[PDB]
Amino acid sequence: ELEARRPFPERMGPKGNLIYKLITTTDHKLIGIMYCVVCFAFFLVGGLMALFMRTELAMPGLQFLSNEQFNQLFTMHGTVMLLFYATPIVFGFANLVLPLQIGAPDVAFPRLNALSFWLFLFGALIAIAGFITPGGAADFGWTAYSPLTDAIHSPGAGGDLWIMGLAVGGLGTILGGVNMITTVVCMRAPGMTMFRMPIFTWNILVTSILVLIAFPILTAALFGLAADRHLGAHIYDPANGGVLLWQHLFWFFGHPEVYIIALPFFGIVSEIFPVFSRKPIFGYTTLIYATLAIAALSVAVWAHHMYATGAVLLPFFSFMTFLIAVPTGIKFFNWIGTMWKGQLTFETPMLFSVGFLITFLLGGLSGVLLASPPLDFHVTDSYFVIAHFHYVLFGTIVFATYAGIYFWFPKMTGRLLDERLGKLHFWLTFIGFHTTFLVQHWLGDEGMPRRYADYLPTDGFTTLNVISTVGAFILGVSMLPFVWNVFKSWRYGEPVTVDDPWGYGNSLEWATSCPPPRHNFTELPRIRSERPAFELHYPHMVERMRAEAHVG
Template identity: 75%
Template sequence: MKLPATSSPAAEPAAQRAAVARPAVPRNPVKWLTTTDHKTIGTLYLVTAFGFFCVGGLLALLMRAELARPGHQLMSNEQFNQAFTMHGTIMLLMFATPLFAGFANWIMPLQIGAPDVAFPRLNMFAYWLYLFGSLIAVGGFLTPQGAADFGWFGYVPLSDAVHSPGAGADMWIMGLAFSGFGTILGSVNFITTIICMRAPGMTMFRMPIFTWNVLLTGVLVLLAFPVLAAALFALEADRKFGAHVFDAANGGALLWQHLFWFFGHPEVYIIALPFFGIISEVIPVFSRKPMFGYIGLIAATVSIAGLS
């Protein structure tokens, strides 16, 4: 008599693991565009940032080619200023800063044992704000007068309606504002995830160094980027509605410098701190030695964030 086939005990845990496995990498482009999985969104951030890196690198090559010999080679004076402005903007705000969001999305939830970030839909919304805001800013090249040409600092009065009347300047201002909102929302998501979604037993001083750096970088973003967004909206109000917020007669040029560099100096550490955390994770693994001075390293990172 033939006995009925039964599944082996070893097969049952495998089936259970498959049932609760993380979502697979989507193959359908529509799923890529509508996903809320933190790994997929992290991949989108990294791929998009690399795409903008290629655009910024091309602009850098054009500038170096123009400066290779005296006289005009490839670009006019205005086109060179546009390339200079957009190169700096792309490399800092469309490449280096989004790398933080890409690595944080991929790695941080895995390190703290969270199934996903706290707000998956907000996570995807933040990515779309970054993508479309950046495309708006770069799209200034398609306007009749070209992209913004006043330097990525956007110093007033060079960026007012008198000295930069083209639509490309308005697209630069509003594009960076939208992209900045995406960075702010992403940082809210990361901070909430780290504070509220750690696995049982994962205390703050058991977290990996990279997770600490993501937390502190998120705090810096919440302090710096709203100031930049407010300054950009005020500048656009000056250009379109004559608000005179940055009127040079009222000290507006100095006001812009104060507001911009309140953002600009923390931005250096918003870019750097995540990579400090990555190095602090990679070296102990491949040297096969534990991290020395864990508490001291956290204290140093907190000090860096505070001083910035």
């Protein structure tokens, strides 16, 4: 019964089978693989700017930069990292496993699914191409307060390209959001009821719903601003009450935006915990309600970004902001209960997902303090807030993203990433991050304001800047082993020839091959619970799963 097999799998394709299949494709699996490659390419560009502005922040004198360059530099870092890396990388993970998770062969509209990626890429390019101009790119922050973006102040051409690129990106985002709702609602397998799908799918569905509300109101505001800058349209005049109109319009978008790039990465950790813990996810019904409550609450909390303005109803936005901190603790406790009383092995996915917990807790703790107007009266618009949103944001889209990559690399490629090369990366990242961002709280507390190009020698805060710069260079060098690992192990990696290399996988993507076929499936199991693949592989556990499920 000997079977003939090759000594080693094929490394690469036969001199051209990708170039034409890159421009005509409608495969969701292919589009996802070409959705992160570009995201990680933009990550480096966004981070190089941070390295520049961190190097020109360690000594009191202006050594090699100017004011204008520094302004453009932090503005473009801020925009590229948020809108050209994170918001997109959300949708990369969607059309990579969601059809596999629901048991569908395809997305609802494939030929529309293709358009979103190209809109993303070209919008991003138009926005970034502001550096070719003799003037430079946008130099007014990602927030874009008015009147500073009026024809009078910031009359350059970089700002115009910024405005007109964000709109083209936002159209792709909306069109991508339209597709996932349809796919979830009307593409499911028989027996896959709404309350039987995994957590990731719920998160993506609610995220899409949130996108549909957040983005159009931003595009409208951008059109309004372009009207002022090109026609002299008297929309955001200070005399006309437009200084606060624009801020309301922007912050109706801004905070739902930061909750667009949070829940999907909650889903990833919620999918990773049960696999490596050899135990079911503790609380399935309640996590859905937590997601729904967090999403619903994050619409009526938008003026907590506007405290120093002294022009908002303070009680309204403080109480609700306190309330949006309740279900997050529920999620934390559910994760802890999931990883409670089970065999844990701590491979790379679990290590990253645990780093996520440790970082995000302090991020959220700092975030709650900002919600009280008395404390934000002293803290706002200083490096304390920068310390805050570089923990709550660095856990979801860095640690959880890497966890997802290490988790789903074999399922998408058929190779295993190295282990001795994936732990050095994690430890470098962790040490570098805590070295560079911990002292920013103190900096903001002593009275160092944000968006300052330089400072005076007799200011007190000099050594903390040196520590931050050292940590930032460690965090910048940390990424070499990861890229090396991906480059090396894509074609010379260890071959996985099973249906699941992680053993106790629960979702339906582990009930197929590595990688899956063109239409994702050659068979389907019988859908009974939220762990179909586990019951496929372990039929002797059904009686032990439905009897031990409840603790009293």
